[PDB]
Amino acid sequence: PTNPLTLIVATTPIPTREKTLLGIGLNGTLPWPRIKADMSFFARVTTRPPRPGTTNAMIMGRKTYDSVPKSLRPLGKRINVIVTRDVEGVSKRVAEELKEKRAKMAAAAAAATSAGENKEEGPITDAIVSSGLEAALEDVEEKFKGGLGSVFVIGGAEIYATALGLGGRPVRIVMTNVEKKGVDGEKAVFECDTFFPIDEELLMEKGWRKVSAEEVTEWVGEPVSGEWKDEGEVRIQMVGYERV
Ligand SMILES: NC(=O)c1ccc[n+]([C@@H]2O[C@H](COP(=O)([O-])OP(=O)(O)OC[C@H]3O[C@@H](n4cnc5c(N)ncnc54)[C@H](OP(=O)(O)O)[C@@H]3O)[C@@H](O)[C@H]2O)c1
Ligand SMILES: C[C@H]1COc2c1c(Oc1cccc(-c3nnn[nH]3)c1)cc1nc(N)nc(N)c21
């Protein structure tokens, strides 16, 4: 049987006339101010190797790559796979940003050692550029072999849409739901220009099953309660869906 593909995503419900949409982005970033708990969950989950001496890959569209501030990409301790139609041109720039990322990480390692910090094994940092999502799955598999840990599809809408259309193989969605806290007991909505490519089929479990908190906990390797948690002016919860 074939290894599962995990979509990880934070969404916000937007009621429309015809149906609730799930908003994920505005103007090339996220629709909401920084949610610390979502970012740390995202960081921990996508970094955490499924067995010792492996490194997880994140596969992402080029715009999502661009959405991270430049000094913070490629994202550390994971293999970053950037999907594009301009492999040639994006490669050169990714190479450039990787090498700067390398410089930062090296200085930090030297400093930590100099500080007497107990160094240990851990996943590596890489970035490679592929011409498609299938190509990226192949590429990362060929490059890393048995050092490859789990594979996440981390967005955005075009790559997610591609992930969901792959010819069957398990696909699971780890989703953080994000909602403004009510004011005078009405809940305002986030403006988004980018949406998760499906919505209703998840909320009404049509071809999808919402799984137990226990199941998600197993997927992501840390306790997930699936309870709402207050984070300033938003509340958030983590859930999972598997295709049926
Ligand atoms: N809330 C969340 O969890 C979350 C997660 C991720 C992203 N987002 C948000 O979503 C937005 C970006 O999403 P998006 O859909 O606009 O962009 P996207 O899917 O991240 O990237 C689209 C780009 O990826 C490349 N690409 C897409 N389809 C391809 C194909 N079939 N073959 C080859 N290359 C392909 C192309 O790059 P080239 O232009 O270089 O060809 C295309 O322009 C941002 O607002 C981001 O903040 C949110
Ligand atoms: C990265 C975007 C794209 O997908 C995601 C991003 C994101 O924002 C950032 C921004 C800047 C840095 C980071 C970051 N820190 N450590 N690792 N990543 C994340 C948050 C996400 N949350 C969920 N639940 N799922 C995703 N697919 C997410």
211: helix, strand or coil: coil
Pairing relationship of beta strands 229-231 and 234-243 according to DSSP bridges: antiparallel
184 C-alpha to ligand 2 centroid (Å): 31
Overall size of the chain counted in residues? 244
Among candidate residues 193, 139, 133, 131, the one with its CA nearest the CA of residue 160: 133
**Which residues share a beta bridge with 55?**
148
Whose CA is closest to 56, among 154, 134, 164?
154
Way it was determined: X-ray
Task: For the chain, list the strands marked E by DSSP.
Answer: 5-15, 20-25, 55-61, 79-83, 126-130, 148-155, 171-180, 194-195, 208-210, 229-231, 234-243
**Torsion angles phi and psi, residue 23, rounded to 5:** -85, 140
**Which residue has tokens 């490629």?**
74
Resolution (A): 2.0
For β-strands 148-155 and 55-61, DSSP reports them as parallel
Gap between the Cα atoms of 92 and 7, Å rounded: 27
Q: Please indicate whether residue 83, judged by its CB atom, sits closer than 6 Å to ligand 1.
A: yes
The closest residue, in CA terms, to atom 47 on ligand 1 is 29
User: Minimal CA–CA distance to 125: which of 99, 107, 151, 163?
Assistant: 99
Q: State which ligand 2 atom lies nearest to the alpha carbon of 69.
A: 11
Is residue 72 a contact partner of residue 50, using CB atoms and an 8 Å limit? Answer: no
Residue 9 near residue 155, CB atoms below 8 Å = yes
Residue 217 burial class via C-beta count within 10 angstroms: exposed 0-12, middle 13-18, buried 19 and up: middle
CA separation, residue 157 to residues 142, 160, 164, 174, 195 (Å): 26, 5, 10, 15, 6
